[PDB]
Amino acid sequence: THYTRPDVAAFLAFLNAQEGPKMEEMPPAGAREMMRVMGQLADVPRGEIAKVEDRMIPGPDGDIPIRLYDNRPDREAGPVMVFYHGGGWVIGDLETHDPYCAEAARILDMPVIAIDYRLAPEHPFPAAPIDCEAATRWVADNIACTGLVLSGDSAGGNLTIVTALALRDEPAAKPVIAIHPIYPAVTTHNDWQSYRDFGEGHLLTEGSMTWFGNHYAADPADRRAAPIDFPADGLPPTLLITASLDPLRDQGRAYAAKLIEAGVPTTYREAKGTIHGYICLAQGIPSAKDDIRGALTVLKAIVAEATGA
Amino acid sequence: THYTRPDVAAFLAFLNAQEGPKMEEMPPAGAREMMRVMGQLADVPRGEIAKVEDRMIPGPDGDIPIRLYDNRPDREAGPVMVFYHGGGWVIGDLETHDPYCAEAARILDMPVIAIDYRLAPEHPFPAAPIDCEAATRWVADNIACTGLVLSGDSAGGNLTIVTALALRDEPAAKPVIAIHPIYPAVTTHNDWQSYRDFGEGHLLTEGSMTWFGNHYAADPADRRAAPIDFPADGLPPTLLITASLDPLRDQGRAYAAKLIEAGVPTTYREAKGTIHGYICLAQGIPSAKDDIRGALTVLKAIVAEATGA
Ligand SMILES: *[C@](=O)([N][C]C1=[C][C]=[C][C]=[C]1)C1=[C][C]=[C][C]=N1
Ligand SMILES: *[C@](=O)([N][C]C1=[C][C]=[C][C]=[C]1)C1=[C][C]=[C][C]=N1
């Protein structure tokens, strides 16, 4: 047995009783619908926030949709967060991670700009990192700010790290002051004890992970697919969080360890007794509100230290 | 060239111009004086604090002197810090680290109890860890508190870890809620790039480290000498700080990385451009004030989160 919060166990039991296909039996449009419906049933609402704006920006393969959240729009220019949603590079959009983005904006008291990057299989690897890099350079070029804070969950956690590395090697007009990968993927392989322990019955399954991987068609030798295989020296101050019952946990730990070994200031949090994907499950798993708030409090402090230096 | 703050370079120019014997050419009593004089010249004063009391407590080889610092002595029962000073298990006492302990008490708003543990060579390994453990159990048995926060620099950083492991395996009457090793030693060997890079001209030298190790006479296979060689699972939330130009840096990094791999919530900070020993040099190196405040602010948060849960 592995430690599991009671409210997590209750949500897992609920999920297991539901009838309906597995995501991996569906075509991409139906998988996409399933994540939207999941958020409607099991995530909190957006809640009160002062400004939400949608717009298009130019990208290398056409327009990239973004969404700006700000709970204090008459702020002086400060750091800005660029957020990259998860969904295994196949699913997710500006609606699935809307509640979390609005919360992030409220708690951090900075603008949050979510990227609707191109998805596989219509646009396989490396469309996602190309879009994320371009949208981030665009924010630096165009949005009133002093620095960037990159963040994202799962696939988006990969995109956080990968975009951080690209901007380390070729600076944007503004520096990345901190990153916050949330239960990130950092490699393509499954040789992890956490994958063997948690790859069934904990929402993110072996089957799902195979289906995502097949659709994305990542090149395992490319830094944008496997950042754990390339030097991490000189990256920004990192807050990396894992979920203790996630198949991705061990690689998260491994990445955080690598950062430290490279001299990168690193805060590691592990959400004990909960699962992959909690940041979009805060109504179905009430304890997720605490994991969200706790992380973002810590990030706010990381950013205040950066800003007061 | 390694990044060095201007004020640190200025302090090292002073240190390198000093005449007379090097610590490692001295007997213990001469090394002990050297450190006291260093603090008088280059540390800040104790400053204003509400309560400071000395007391002798029972230990397995005789009385152990301790000193309590509290800037709010009418406090409700809350956590208490137990502090183990550094000095390579040979030098240091309650006076050498007095300014830092008073500062810690002010910033953390918790009582700090420093331990005057037995020193080598009069009392070689394992007298220090025996005393530190017994004193810590005594605080838990005798002082009004809800939990312990263990902390200490260099040798004291080893003692923090080593005492935390002992209390993990056999609980004290109160839990250890967090630890704060500062530029800790975690092994006896010198096979580290940071040792080769910084073992000359940055205060803590190959010669000083050899002299300390020879007098302490630690057993390299004992967990109390080499905690990096034993499991770290189940340790408390950890704040570990290194100094970028410290010979001990890389082992500190390695230990922080080990904690993460074991699933321990870990905050890693690296004081970039400064040296081993900075927490007692806050007048000679004015930037050390910021390293001190910055770390203690973070620790205060780690503690408020533990207490709020
Ligand atoms: C990832 O993006 N997963 C996000 C997610 C999937 C299902 C439900 C909720 C969230 C991911 C998973 C595995 C490998 C890489 N990326
Ligand atoms: C350590 O305690 N060093 C503390 C110190 C020594 C000299 C001056 C100022 C501070 C230490 C060093 C090396 C190994 C183990 N412990």
Phi, psi (deg, nearest 5) at residue A54: -105, 145
Between residues 201 and 260 of chain A, which touch chain B (CB distance below 8 Å)? Answer: 244, 253-254, 256-258, 260
Residues from chain A that touch B257, judged by Cβ atoms under 8 A, are 256-258, 260-261
Strands B148-153 and B176-182 turn out to be parallel
Is the minimum distance from the CB of A176 to ligand 1 under 6 angstroms?
Answer: no
Contact A268/B268, CB-based, under 8 Å? yes
The angle that helices B288-308 and B98-108 make with each other, rounded to 10 degrees, is: 40
Strands B64-70 and B51-57 turn out to be antiparallel
Of A54, A40, A134, A39, nearest in space to A87 by CA? A39
Is there a catalytic annotation at residue A2?
no
Interval between CA A305 and ligand 2 midpoint (Å): 28
Contact A253/B260, CB-based, under 8 Å? yes
Which of B244, B253, B265 minimises the CB distance to A261? Answer: B253
> Which H helix or E strand runs over A12?
helix A6-17
d(CA B187, CA B95): 27
Is A63's Cβ below 8 Å from some Cβ in B? no
A229-232 contacts, C-beta under 8 A, 24 or more apart = A229/A187, A230/A165, A231/A262, A232/A165, A232/A258, A232/A259, A232/A262, A232/A264
Interval between CA A87 and ligand 1 midpoint (Å): 5
- DSSP code of residue B214: H
Interval between CA B154 and ligand 2 midpoint (Å): 5
The angle that helices B127-142 and B155-169 make with each other, rounded to 10 degrees, is: 60
Distance from CA of A180 to the nearest CA of B (A): 14
Contact B260/A260, CB-based, under 8 Å? yes
State the Cα torsion A207-A209-A215-A219 to the nearest 10°.
-130
Interval between CA A7 and ligand 1 midpoint (Å): 21
Residues from chain B that touch A306, judged by Cβ atoms under 8 A, are none
Structural domains of chain A sorted by starting position, each given as residue range(s) with its CATH number in brackets? 6-307 (3.40.50.1820)
Best probe residue, ligand 2, of B24, B40, B154, B274 (max atoms within 8 Å of C-beta): B154
Interval between CA B155 and ligand 2 midpoint (Å): 6
**Closest protein CA for atom 8 of ligand 1:** A277
d(CA A241, CA A94): 22
Q: Is A195 in contact with A162 (CB distance < 8 Å)?
A: no
Is B269's Cβ below 8 Å from some Cβ in A? yes
Which residue numbers come right before each break in chain B (C to N over 2.5 Å)? none
d(CA B216, CA B116): 16
User: Which one-letter amino acid corresponds to residue B125?
Assistant: F
| Paired tokens of A154 | 């799962």
Contact B256/A253, CB-based, under 8 Å? no
Q: Resolution of the coordinates in A? A: 1.8
Q: Is B271 exposed, middle or buried (0-12, 13-18, 19+ CB in 10 A)?
A: buried
Q: How far is CA A186 from the centre of its chain?
A: 12
Q: Is B292 exposed, middle or buried (0-12, 13-18, 19+ CB in 10 A)?
A: buried
What ligand is nearest to the CA atom of residue B212? 2
Is the minimum distance from the CB of A278 to ligand 1 under 6 angstroms?
Answer: no
d(CA A241, CA A256): 9
Residues from chain A that touch B268, judged by Cβ atoms under 8 A, are 260, 265-268
Within chain B, how many helices (H) and strands (E) appear?
9, 8
d(CA A14, CA A7): 11
Strands B80-84 and B148-153 turn out to be parallel
Is there a catalytic annotation at residue B189?
no
**Given the residues A93, A246, A250, A291, the one annotated as active site:** A246
- Please name the residues in contact with A32: beta carbons below 8 A apart, sequence gap of 6 or more: A90, A91, A92, A93
Q: Is B183 in contact with B295 (CB distance < 8 Å)?
A: no
Q: Is A235 in contact with A183 (CB distance < 8 Å)?
A: no
> Which H helix or E strand runs over B84?
strand B80-84
Q: Is A67 in contact with A95 (CB distance < 8 Å)?
A: no
Is there a catalytic annotation at residue A141?
no
